[PDB]
Amino acid sequence: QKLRFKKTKKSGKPPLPGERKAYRKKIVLSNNNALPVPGLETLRPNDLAKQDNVGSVKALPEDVVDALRAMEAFKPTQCWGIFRQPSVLIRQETVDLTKKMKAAGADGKTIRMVIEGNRVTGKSLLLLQAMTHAFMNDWVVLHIPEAQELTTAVTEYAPIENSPLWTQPTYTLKLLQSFKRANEKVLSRMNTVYSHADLPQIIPVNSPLLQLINSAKEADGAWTVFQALWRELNAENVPGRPPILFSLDGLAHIMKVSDYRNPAFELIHSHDLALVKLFTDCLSGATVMPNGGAVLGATTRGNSPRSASMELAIAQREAEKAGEKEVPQRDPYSKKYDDRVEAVMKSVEILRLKGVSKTEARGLLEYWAASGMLKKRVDESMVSEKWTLSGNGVVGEMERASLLTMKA
Amino acid sequence: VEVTPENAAALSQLSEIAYGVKAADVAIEGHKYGLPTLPLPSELHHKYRYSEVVNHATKLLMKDGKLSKAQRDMAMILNYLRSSPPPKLNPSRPLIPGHPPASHLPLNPVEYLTVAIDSVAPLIKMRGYKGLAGGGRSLEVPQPIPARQRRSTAFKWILDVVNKKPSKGSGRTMFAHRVAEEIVAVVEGRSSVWDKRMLIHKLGTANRANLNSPALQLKGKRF
Amino acid sequence: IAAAKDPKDTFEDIPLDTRHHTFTKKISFPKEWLLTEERKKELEAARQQALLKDAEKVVQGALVDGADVVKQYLESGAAE
RNA sequence: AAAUGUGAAUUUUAGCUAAUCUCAAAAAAUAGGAUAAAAAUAUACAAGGAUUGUAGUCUGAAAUUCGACUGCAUGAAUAAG
Numbered sequence: 001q002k003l004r005f006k007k008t009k010k011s012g013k014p015p016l017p018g019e020r021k022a023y024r025k026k027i028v029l030s031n032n033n034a035l036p037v038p039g040l041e042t043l044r045p046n047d048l049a050k051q052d053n054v055g056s057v058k059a060l061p062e063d064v065v066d067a068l069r070a071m072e073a074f075k076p077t078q079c080w081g082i083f084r085q086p087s088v089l090i091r092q093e094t095v096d097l098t099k100k101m102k103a104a105g106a107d108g109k110t111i112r113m114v115i116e117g118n119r120v121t122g123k124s125l126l127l128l129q130a131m132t133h134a135f136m137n138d139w140v141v142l143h144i145p146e147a148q149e150l151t152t153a154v155t156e157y158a159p160i161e162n163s164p165l166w167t168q169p170t171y172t173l174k175l176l177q178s179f180k181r182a183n184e185k186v187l188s189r190m191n192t193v194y195s196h197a198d199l200p201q202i203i204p205v206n207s208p209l210l211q212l213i214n215s216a217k218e219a220d221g222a223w224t225v226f227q228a229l230w231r232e233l234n235a236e237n238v239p240g241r242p243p244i245l246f247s248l249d250g251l252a253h254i255m256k257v258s259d260y261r262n263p264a265f266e267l268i269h270s271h272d273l274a275l276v277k278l279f280t281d282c283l284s285g286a287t288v289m290p291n292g293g294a295v296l297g298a299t300t301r302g303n304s305p306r307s308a309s310m311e312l313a314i315a316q317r318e319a320e321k322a323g324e325k326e327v328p329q330r331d332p333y334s335k336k337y338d339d340r341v342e343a344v345m346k347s348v349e350i351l352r353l354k355g356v357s358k359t360e361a362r363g364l365l366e367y368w369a370a371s372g373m374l375k376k377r378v379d380e381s382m383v384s385e386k387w388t389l390s391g392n393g394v395v396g397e398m399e400r401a402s403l404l405t406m407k408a
Numbered sequence: 409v410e411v412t413p414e415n416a417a418a419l420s421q422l423s424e425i426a427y428g429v430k431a432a433d434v435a436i437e438g439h440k441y442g443l444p445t446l447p448l449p450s451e452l453h454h455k456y457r458y459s460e461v462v463n464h465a466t467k468l469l470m471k472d473g474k475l476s477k478a479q480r481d482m483a484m485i486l487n488y489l490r491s492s493p494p495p496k497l498n499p500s501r502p503l504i505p506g507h508p509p510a511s512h513l514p515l516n517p518v519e520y521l522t523v524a525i526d527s528v529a530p531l532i533k534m535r536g537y538k539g540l541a542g543g544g545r546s547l548e549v550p551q552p553i554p555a556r557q558r559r560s561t562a563f564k565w566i567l568d569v570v571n572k573k574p575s576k577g578s579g580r581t582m583f584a585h586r587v588a589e590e591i592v593a594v595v596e597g598r599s600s601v602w603d604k605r606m607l608i609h610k611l612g613t614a615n616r617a618n619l620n621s622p623a624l625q626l627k628g629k630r631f
Numbered sequence: 632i633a634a635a636k637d638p639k640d641t642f643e644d645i646p647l648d649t650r651h652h653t654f655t656k657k658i659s660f661p662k663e664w665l666l667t668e669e670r671k672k673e674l675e676a677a678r679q680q681a682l683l684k685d686a687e688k689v690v691q692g693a694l695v696d697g698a699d700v701v702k703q704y705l706e707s708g709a710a711e
Numbered sequence: 712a713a714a715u716g717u718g719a720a721u722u723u724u725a726g727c728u729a730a731u732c733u734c735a736a737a738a739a740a741u742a743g744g745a746u747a748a749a750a751a752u753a754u755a756c757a758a759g760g761a762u763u764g765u766a767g768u769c770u771g772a773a774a775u776u777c778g779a780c781u782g783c784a785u786g787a788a789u790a791a792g
């Protein structure tokens with residue numbers, strides 16, 4: 001037999017389920033070591049629309065942070081836990097978008113816009129400012145934190161009888177639970193006006209609308225309750241129905257063929273998912289909002305596929321706005337386009353985000369310095385240095401060069 | 409007292425030359441916006457832009473020439489120390505003299521790291537002479553070590569304790585936060601590296617007489 | 632040329648296919664940066680507005696300096 | 712380049728015998744994202760890709776002794792010595 005040498009064979013409590021995932025996804029919104037910035041004002045109900053506030057940093061109210069936190073508006077990749085109080089930079093792009101939401105909700109119209117930009121320019125956070133203006137002005141915010149959770153086939157899905165659509169019960173349930181906490185104040189003032197026959201429970205007309213949402217205790221009847229809720233919020237002629245802000249982050253995920261498989265093992269299109277089929281209809285104008293509001297779709301660059309149809313549409317809409325007689329056209333021999341993506345994006349408005357101005361960059365640096373997190377003399381010579389290293393004022397890059405450095 | 413250009417620099421004490429409003433004459437003075445005062449601060453040399461301790465400790469995290477990763481880890485460590493509560497110094501483990509109070513370390517994460525490394529770093533090293541203590545045994549003799557050797561030994565002990573600890577969470581901050589927590593345990597005196605520091609110091613005191621041993625002075629003088 | 636003149640099929644339905652060719656994009660120095668007599672006046676304005684913006688704060692004592700902010704906070708016994 | 716095939720590859724040759732045309736695309740990195748009681752409590756058997764079955768492709772009279780790759784299935788040791 002073999003005589004060679006062989007190494008003969010031969011601690012702590014392990015984490016609980018979901019503990020690891022919750023570690024890399026928790027959001028810290030304070031730092032006791034950070035200094036309280038003197039003169040830091042809080043956002044009034046009408047501060048994200050004043051032209052004079054451009055370039056100034058203001059703190060978010062306490063109740064707003066509870067609502068924004070409820071619907072997962074903050075993200076771990078963002079630098080919030082470095083300062084004491086969550087504050088945002090009122091930006092010239094914020095006043096533009098907000099002034100439209102203000103007029104839209106007042107005139108009963110609906111703005112259907114798409115936000116675009118570079119890797120980290122403030123797309124995801126420009127929505128956080130749109131939702132902030134919505135909560136403070138008594139709107140109904142329906143936010144979808146990550147659009148990749150609806151397309152990457154990571155949640156339960158079931159078909160609808162006699163239709164090509166597909167529902168996602170486990171996600172729709174979780175979506176209602178977070179919809180209550182965020183809009184608890186606005187919903188408390190509204191009651192039902194229609195007779196919903198099929199529901200997990202009996203609900204008479206003229207009852208607390210918040211009761212209708214509490215019927216969805218199981219994932220099965222989750223979608224049915226949602227459609228009923230959607231009918232109430234969009235009551236044609238009912239006093240007290242506020243505008244609706246239907247926002248979605250990661251637009252590039254719902255503009256392609258999803259990863260789900262139908263019984264024939266054929267990829268399901270993202271626009272067939274009942275929940276995604278609702279946002280695209282509101283974004284395309286097919287489904288009208290009688291009370292008005294805004295439908296905002298923000299793209300993303302971190303973990304985002306490329307859809308030539310969306311990129312072409314965004315390019316065509318910007319060309320028509322500029323007035324160019326010639327508009328980008330399809331590549332007559334490319335097979336990466338999607339007719340349905342073109343139809344949805346055929347009338348939306350584009351909002352390109354780029355680096356901030358040197359005046360806004362100062363207001364953001366002074367806030368970091370006042371908090372003791374940037375030990376430098378904030379002057380024109382220092383603002384232009386950070387403004388240059390950040391690639392013409394890209395807010396995302398300006399943080400890595402000032403806050404996430406190893407020099408202080 | 410409204411300020412205007414004709415009186416801005418006069419009333420604000422700012423140099424118009426530094427701002428380029430009234431530049432100098434290049435054909436005569438050679439410059440256009442003033443000359444930097446020499447000698448320059450050490451931090452302005454692109455090879456010495458980071459602190460000596462931070463730059464030295466960063467490259468000890470590096471593996472396989474991945475300096476960009478180690479630089480982001482050191483940035484996460486200094487960010488963790490900056491968000492942690494002030495430490496509670498232990499009188500049994502006196503830090504290096506002259507350090508700032510514990511209340512100042514959080515806002516100064518670089519000093520937080522420096523005070524930690526310079527506090528557990530040993531002051532001596534044990535060198536052995538082959539076959540001079542008896543029947544084939546070596547003669548261990550202590551000797552002092554420069555700063556870079558003190559910090560290198562210290563931070564390598566910290567990384568040795570870190571690698572052996574179990575995993576806690578997920579993401580890109582696992583290793584960074586795991587190291588930062590050990591940096592805090594050192595300043596609070598409840599770390600394991602303090603034992604390794606005292607263990608090597610005992611060998612020095614237990615062998616302080618070997619500096620003049622008969623074997624070390626009779627190598628080839630007993631023909 | 633004879634086949635091109637053939638009126639049988641003009642192939643107008645077929646778009647010109649240029650996938651065999653790799654188009655190259657060239658970059659040029661921005662013409663807005665050329666230091667002309669008009670731009671010199673533009674810089675003088677920016678160079679002067681910078682001095683005013685800082686001068687206004689130095690007088691009002693609003694020029695932020697992160698170094699001194701942290702120092703005073705630690706020396707004012709406010710950090711417990 | 713186009714077309715065909717899940718893939719190896721095939722069909723057909725535009726150009727170049729070359730700082731011109733072609734092989735040809737760098738990867739690590741950078742930035743996001745997913746997965747954890749990520750093997751020792753057997754209803755939670757990790758990572759791993761050896762061994763073998765089977766269906767194919769390319770080169771060449773010729774691939775059995777005895778070639779190189781591809782698809783599907785199989786899923787060994789291996790706790791850093």
Ligand SMILES: Nc1ncnc2c1ncn2[C@@H]1O[C@H](COP(=O)(O)OP(=O)(O)OP(=O)(O)O)[C@@H](O)[C@H]1O
Nearest residue numbers: 078079089119120121122123124125300301302396
């Ligand atoms: N107005 C602002 N005020 C303060 N900080 C901001 C502001 N806008 C953006 N930031 C910061 O800039 C960084 C990137 O912002 P954000 O995450 O919104 O970018 P993004 O466009 O959504 O990126 P991606 O394409 O990867 O999804 C974050 O740290 C964010 O806090």
Ligand SMILES: [Mg+2]
Nearest residue numbers: 123124299300
């Ligand atoms: Mg985003």
Ligand SMILES: [Mg+2]
Nearest residue numbers: 579580742743
């Ligand atoms: Mg990574």
Ligand SMILES: [Mg+2]
Nearest residue numbers: 651712713714
């Ligand atoms: Mg080819």
Ligand SMILES: [Mg+2]
Nearest residue numbers: 734735736737
């Ligand atoms: Mg090759």
Ligand SMILES: [Mg+2]
Nearest residue numbers: 575749750757
């Ligand atoms: Mg393991």
Ligand SMILES: [Mg+2]
Nearest residue numbers: 757758759786
């Ligand atoms: Mg496996």
Ligand SMILES: [Mg+2]
Nearest residue numbers: 774775777778
């Ligand atoms: Mg063979």
Ligand SMILES: [Mg+2]
Nearest residue numbers: 007789791792
């Ligand atoms: Mg080995």
